Amino acid sequence: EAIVKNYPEGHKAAAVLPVLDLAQRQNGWLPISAMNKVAEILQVPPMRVYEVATFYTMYNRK
Amino acid sequence: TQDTQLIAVDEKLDITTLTGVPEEHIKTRKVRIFVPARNNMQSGVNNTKKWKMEFDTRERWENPLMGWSSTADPLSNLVLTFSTKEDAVAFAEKNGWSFDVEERKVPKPKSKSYGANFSWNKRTRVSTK
Amino acid sequence: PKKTSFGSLKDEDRIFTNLYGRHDWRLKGAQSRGDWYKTKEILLKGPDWILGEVKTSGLRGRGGAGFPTGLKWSFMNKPSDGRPKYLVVNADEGEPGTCKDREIIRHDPHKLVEGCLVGGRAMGARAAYIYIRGEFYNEASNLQVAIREAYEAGLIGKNACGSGYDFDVFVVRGAGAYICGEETALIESIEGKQGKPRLKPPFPADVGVFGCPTTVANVETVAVSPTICRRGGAWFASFGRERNSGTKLFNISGHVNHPCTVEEEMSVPLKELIEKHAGGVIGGWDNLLAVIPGGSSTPLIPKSVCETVLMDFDALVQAQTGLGTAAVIVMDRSTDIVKAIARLIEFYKHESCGQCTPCREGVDWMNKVMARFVKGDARPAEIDSLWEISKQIEGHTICALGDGAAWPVQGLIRHFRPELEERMQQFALQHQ
Ligand SMILES: Cc1cc2nc3c(=O)[nH]c(=O)nc-3n(C[C@H](O)[C@H](O)[C@H](O)COP(=O)(O)O)c2cc1C
Ligand code: SF4
């Protein structure tokens, strides 16, 4: 919620990259359930989360 | 112009008796003046710049021996091209063919803008690239 | 009157005084080193004054381009339009050979914070988004510690330094992409989408992050900006050649005896900088095969040219290369130049975002061609074929990564065609 607050109102999707990173820290890797949970908590379509996860290297999908 | 006792022939031109077309194939047919629509499979409009005249499709049965598309309509694969609608209708009336001209549809000029993809207040902001 | 041999910068006139963490990097040490001093006067002087003094200083973009920082920053001096205004500091630092930004972030973060403050006031921005790369976790944490110290001290935030200005410095972390260094790609990466660069019929001054006007600067230029305001534009203008003023953090590496980072004045002799600050090339200057001046994007240059080349933008432009990010990469005679350039092309292929066709397909093709070249599995015609492919990539991509991948190939061909020819001949004779 602090990370989301660090962005302009109405553009919560900007928090997708850090929020997903948080899902990494408490899980080591990123399961698809974490992907969908990030999508839910960020009110963003799951496909965009999948895209940003597969694009950037640091996100461990396995 | 033409000095040979140039005669007034005001009545409309008609060569229905000078074409050899049989009785059946000159009024029971209905030509169609139209600008062909762009093939939605492609994205090129070079085939939508010339008017075309075509005849109504008729019976097309299967050949008993092999199964070909047998037909008995001579004016089935004959499609004329025309630079303008008026010339096409002039040809249709000249040959005595009933027509139904469709106006040429034109893509309405849109308003494209790259910036709208990344708008700040509007809903046109894209969620992906 | 006018200095001829631009070099040997003095310790007194150096923007960054804590390169190697020899002094306290917190607020106390920064104030001890002249940082965060008389900032209120700069804040109250007026954005136009700051922009004019930046133009007078002649500061050019120290992030890889060469655009005048004054003109780019004054592009935001337009009146308000309801939309907020944003300053963004690029700290991706993905270009190979670059080491300056990491050093300034983890050793002089308060200079960076004051730079965001003064820049945002000059351009009317409401907040700053320092986009550090994901790998620099310790550096980002140090930067945020300095940010918290400044926030507690009241230098930033509501009533920044008591001048009535309200500024914020958020630090968005990257996620491991070199293309995120591109300003428009950085903008989308901040916005939450992938790091694909945006086309530029619209410019960041008009449409940037979240659609609001944004301006992307580099860590180095914003860091030197408060010093530019304090010491003065003419003081910066004194150093370096004309239109090539200022001091730069040169990152020296490769086959140098003592690879390092030094703050040296512009238009410096390459030989002198290599010899003194870096310690010379391993095996002496005679053992030098090639020099990459400013990172992977800048084409390499051979030793014969390296003998006498000034380190300003224009001098290297005349040398059929670019200053880029002042990333000196020296390669000795024991270096397989083909192998090194192929590795650079492999890096670019691995870092291409794949948006536009010339970079997505072309760079991979150049990678395959160079992989065959390293083993000499080709014929003389494919050298010209590779040159043509590199030209086709150039000037046809959305961002400059395509050109930054094509330039190394052009430089390698132009300066070592005989090496490729002879390696190919050796492979041909061996395969008999
Ligand atoms: C592929 C690519 C990578 C870049 N990486 C960086 C980078 O790591 N740091 C940086 O400051 N600028 C980088 N840039 C340059 C920026 O896109 C932009 O031109 C610059 O940051 C603007 O600020 P400046 O004028 O102070 O350099 C990169 C550009 C490209 C095309
Ligand atoms: S040049 Fe490469 S990185 Fe740049 S937009 Fe095109 S595909 Fe993406």
CA C370-C375-C378 angle, 5° bins? 70
> Which of B118, B123, B125 should be substituted to probe chain C, the one whose Cβ sees the most C Cβ atoms within 10 Å?
B118
Nearest protein Cα to ligand 1, atom 12: C63
Written as six digits, the tokens of B126 are 């894209």
Judging by beta carbons within 10 Å of its beta carbon (0-12, 13-18, 19+), is residue C94 exposed, middle or buried? buried
- C261, β-bridge pairs: C251
Q: Where are the beta strands (DSSP E) in C300-431?
A: 301-302, 327-332
Cβ atoms of C404 and C362 within 8 Å: the answer is no
Strand order in the sheet with C157-160: C157-160, C165-173, C127-132, C86-91, C214-218
Q: Entry resolution in angstroms?
A: 3.4
Cβ atoms of C224 and C231 within 8 Å: the answer is no
Q: How far is A3 from chain C (nearest CA, A)?
A: 10
Radius of gyration of chain C (CA): 22
Is the CB of residue C259 below 6 angstroms from any atom belonging to ligand 1?
no
Rounded CA-CA distance C218/C32 in Å is 25
Is the CB of residue C99 below 6 angstroms from any atom belonging to ligand 1?
no
For C166, list phi and psi in degrees, rounded to 5. -120, 105
Written as six digits, the tokens of B31 are 């030509």
> Angle C401-430/C337-351 helices, nearest 10 degrees?
140
Rounded CA-CA distance A17/C199 in Å is 22
Rounded CA-CA distance C325/C297 in Å is 9
Is the CB of residue C120 below 6 angstroms from any atom belonging to ligand 2?
no
Please state how this structure was obtained: cryo-EM
Is the CB of residue C184 below 6 angstroms from any atom belonging to ligand 2?
no
A13, B128: Cβ pair inside 8 Å? no
**In Å, what is the CA distance from C364 to each residue of B60, C229, C345, C377, C396?**
54, 45, 8, 17, 16
Rounded CA-CA distance C282/C295 in Å is 20
Q: How far is C238 from chain B (nearest CA, A)?
A: 41
**Shortest CA distance from B121: residue in chain A:** A10
Amino acid identity of B70? S
- Chain C residues in contact with B114 (beta carbon < 8 A): 199, 201-202
Cα(C351) to centroid(ligand 2), Å: 9
Rounded CA-CA distance C207/B114 in Å is 10
Cβ atoms of C176 and A57 within 8 Å: the answer is yes
- Chain A residues in contact with B127 (beta carbon < 8 A): 13, 44-45, 48
Written as six digits, the tokens of A29 are 């890797």
Tokens 């630079």 sit on residue: B83
Range A3-7, long-range pairs (CB < 8 A, 24+ positions): A4/A42, A6/C170, A7/C210
Per-residue buried b or exposed e for B36-67, using 16+ beta carbons within 10 Å of the residue's own CB: eeeeeeeeeeeeeeebbbbbeeeeeeeeeeee
- Chain B residues in contact with A45 (beta carbon < 8 A): 127
Rounded CA-CA distance B38/B46 in Å is 8
Residue C283 annotated in ligand binding: no
CA proximity to B11, closest of B94, B97, B99: B94
User: Please, which residues 196-225 of chain C have a Cβ atom closer than 8 Å to chain A?
Assistant: 209-210, 212
**In Å, what is the CA distance from A34 to each residue of A52, A59, C129?**
13, 12, 27
Rounded CA-CA distance C189/C131 in Å is 9
Q: How far is B112 from chain A (nearest CA, A)?
A: 24
Residue C355 annotated in ligand binding: yes
Cβ atoms of C101 and C174 within 8 Å: the answer is no
Residue C101 annotated in ligand binding: yes
Cα(C221) to centroid(ligand 1), Å: 12
Distance of CA B6 to the CA centre of its chain: 36
Neighbours of chain B (3+ CB pairs under 8 A): A, C
Is the CB of residue C231 below 6 angstroms from any atom belonging to ligand 2?
no
C191, A13: Cβ pair inside 8 Å? yes
Is C306 strand, coil or helix? helix
Q: B5 and chain A: CB distance < 8 Å anywhere?
A: no
Minimal Cβ distance to B129: which of C194, C207, C211: C194
- C290, β-bridge pairs: C302, C331
Nearest protein Cα to ligand 1, atom 18: C183
- Chain C residues in contact with B115 (beta carbon < 8 A): 201-202, 206-207
Cα(C399) to centroid(ligand 2), Å: 6
List helix spans (H) across C89-244. 100-107, 109-123, 137-153, 183-191, 219-231, 233-238
Residue C397 annotated in ligand binding: yes
C202, B129: Cβ pair inside 8 Å? no
Rounded CA-CA distance C413/C404 in Å is 15
CA proximity to B75, closest of B53, B94, B91: B53
Rounded CA-CA distance C195/C138 in Å is 23
CA proximity to C341, closest of C351, C353, C331: C331
Render B57-126 in DSSP notation, one character per residue.
Answer: ---EEE-TTT--EEE--STTS--EEESSHHHHHHHHHHTT-B--------PPP----SGGGG-SSSTT--
B118, C198: Cβ pair inside 8 Å? yes
